[PDB]
Design a protein around this ligand. Structure first.
Ligand code: VHC
Ligand code: MG
Length: 216
């Protein structure tokens, strides 16, 4: 094929977010399973936004009426994907929410961690997404909002992330978090383990969750 050109935007994480990610990555914590509760909670919050917006404006559901969460483990590429049909993020929402803007709870949470707090407290500080780095070496976030095109955010930490127009499968609307799992965190690809953690932490979220299991 003739050589194609793709635009990429590399951003530096806000300093405190980068410090938080280094803490999460380089420190042992028990109870790493709470990452899934945090991502399902973000999906539920996003699904609430489209549900309520759609009450006044039904055309907001022209990108899909079904409000749900899908969990997709893939043992072949060692990824766990959390997909929702929530509001999604415009390019600006994506850059603003995933690393460039100082998060209100980062400073207090790092101090709490430095005082020996359990990593499970992360969600209360509004930085729950970053718990993905307890189990993932890289995270890819695909997002599609009704007012913009589909974007792909990615980071392997190291203080930077990239944003580009997504060349993968278009989604109608919502967000997909792809966790590229660490070699010692493959239990999160096992359906029994996923069911255990969803029953423990994510029973009352407000939307149906479907677990897709690859046939053996
Ligand atoms: C840090 C972060 C990462 C992701 C992938 C999502 C949300 C957040 C976060 O902490 N957001 C703060 C609350 C405002 O959140 C939103 C603002 C605009 C759009 C969205 C969420 S949709 C969304 C964002 C995040 N996760 C999901 N599944 N959906
Ligand atoms: Mg909620």
């Amino acid at each position: 094929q003739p050589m194609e050109e793709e635009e990429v935007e590399t951003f530096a994480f806000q300093a405190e977010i980068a410090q938080l990610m280094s803490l999460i990555i380089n420190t042992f914590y028990s109870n790493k399973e709470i990452f899934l509760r945090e991502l399902i909670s973000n999906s539920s919050d996003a699904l609430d936004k489209i549900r309520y917006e759609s009450l006044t404006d039904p055309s907001k559901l022209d990108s899909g009426k079904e409000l749900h969460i899908n969990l997709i483990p893939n043992k072949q590429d060692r990824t766990l994907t959390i997909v929702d049909t929530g509001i999604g993020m415009t390019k600006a929402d994506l850059i603003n929410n995933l690393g460039t803007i100082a998060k209100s709870g980062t400073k207090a949470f790092m101090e709490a961690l430095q005082a020996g707090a359990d990593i499970s407290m992360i969600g209360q500080f509004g930085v729950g997404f970053y718990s993905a780095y307890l189990v993932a070496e890289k995270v890819t976030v695909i997002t599609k909002h009704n007012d913009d095109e589909q974007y792909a955010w990615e980071s392997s930490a190291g203080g930077s992330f990239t944003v580009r127009t997504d060349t993968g499968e278009p989604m109608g609307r919502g967000t997909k978090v792809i966790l590229h799992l660490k070699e010692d965190q493959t239990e999160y690809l096992e359906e029994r383990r996923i069911k255990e953690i969803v029953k423990k932490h994510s029973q009352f979220i407000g939307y149906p969750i479907t677990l897709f299991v690859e046939k053996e």
